[PDB]
């Protein structure tokens, strides 16, 4: 047994058919010592008497909210959640495997710049008796996370997307990251406890926003165009320090440049698309920005 938060405990249950579980000792959080009784959830049945209660936790039926009483008053509550493992594997029912980048991707994080601000997101099929708790640090309590919030609801499979915005308190955008950020998500469905962790460097989760203000300037030759764009508004400043690189594609042909302009040959009915990437570090390319011929 271990404390998750005040009056909330986790019991690691190694489940297989024939028992035998964990022998758990609960202690009443009170200066009192006498006339203490114990109940479980929504039953009046006295499970035990005394400041302490010994429980054999073998299944979800032994989990729940234990309460201690004295003189017709509740003294404290102890909520027992289970972290179930079967065949040495912890349960991962609450979060859906995003199956991209690889398999066993439950959390996904992304940064639009080097500010120290980032977002993590996950998917669930659960709509009730659900709670998420997000914690983060570098290595060192530098990171503050907001509350996990429902950000989307996709239909047929009926999945709910949750997202959280985190921020590194003492970030140095111009320095070299030596220790990675850790993102920890606690997931509780009814009496079932689950965990999810992500370890990354901000530089690795960078995905800039698309190039903006994509314009075409027709040239002297028919079908020859001068394409221009600008850096996204959310990207790190100054742009002369935090440089981007671009990819220009005629869709319906390809050109890589560090400049915000290019000359290509347009077929009418075709589209010119532009995407951006950090010039110095191989992180993700942005979504395509597009303009018709």
């Amino acid at each position, epitope marked *: 047994i271990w404390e998750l938060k005040k009056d909330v405990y986790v019991v690691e249950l190694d*489940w*297989y*058919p024939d028992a035998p579980g964990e022998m758990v000792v609960l202690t009443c959080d009170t200066p009192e010592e006498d006339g203490i009784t114990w109940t479980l*959830d*929504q039953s009046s049945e006295v499970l035990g008497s005394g400041k302490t209660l010994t429980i054999q936790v073998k*299944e*979800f*039926g032994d989990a729940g909210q234990y309460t201690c009483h004295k003189g017709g008053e509740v003294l404290s509550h102890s909520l027992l959640l289970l972290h179930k493992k*079967e065949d040495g594997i912890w*349960s991962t*029912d609450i979060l859906k495997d995003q199956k991209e980048p690889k398999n066993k991707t439950f959390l996904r994080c992304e940064a639009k710049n080097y500010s120290g601000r980032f977002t993590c997101w996950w998917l669930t*099929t*659960i709509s009730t008796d659900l709670t998420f708790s997000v914690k983060s640090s570098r290595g060192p309590q530098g990171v503050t996370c907001g509350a996990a919030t429902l950000s989307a609801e996709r239909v047929r499979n009926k999945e709910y997307e949750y997202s959280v915005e985190c921020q590194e308190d003492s970030a140095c955008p111009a320095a070299e990251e030596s220790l990675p950020i850790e993102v920890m998500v606690d997931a509780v*469905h*009814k*009496l*079932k406890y689950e965990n999810y962790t992500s370890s990354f460097f901000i530089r690795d989760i960078i995905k800039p926003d698309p190039p903006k203000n994509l314009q075409l300037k027709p040239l002297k030759n028919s079908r020859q165009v001068e394409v221009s764009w600008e850096y996204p508004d959310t990207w790190s400043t100054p742009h002369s320090y935090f440089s981007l690189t671009f990819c220009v594609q005629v869709q319906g042909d390809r050109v890589f440049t560090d400049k915000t302009s290019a000359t290509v040959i347009c077929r009418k009915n075709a589209s010119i698309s532009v995407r951006a990437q950090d010039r110095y570090y191989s992180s993700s390319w942005s979504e395509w920005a597009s303009v018709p011929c």
Partner: nanobody
Amino acid sequence: EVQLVESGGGLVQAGGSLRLSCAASGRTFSWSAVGWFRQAPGKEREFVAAIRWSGGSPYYADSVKDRFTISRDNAKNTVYLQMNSLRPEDTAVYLCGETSLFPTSRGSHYDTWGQGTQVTVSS
């Protein structure tokens, strides 16, 4: 929501066999399990066995560990309870429940129930 419908009960000679079936309209989660319970005259409701649709090992109450066998059919969306070497003590209303907290023998952990099937073992 998902509905459960149990069938296969009736009168049987003490020593015979019968197979109960529980037809589900769906499952609410992919890790959902169906549990069989029973209510005997005078006694409290008792857990018998539970199986997940996703498979794996079932969960059996000690009092029944194999002479009863819980199995499932995902194509048919039905959970079966095979009862062998039936005794008059097995006379009860056999009930079907759905849970997202496998393993559990706790009735309150089962969110939806069937109506029940009567099993009478005439000695």
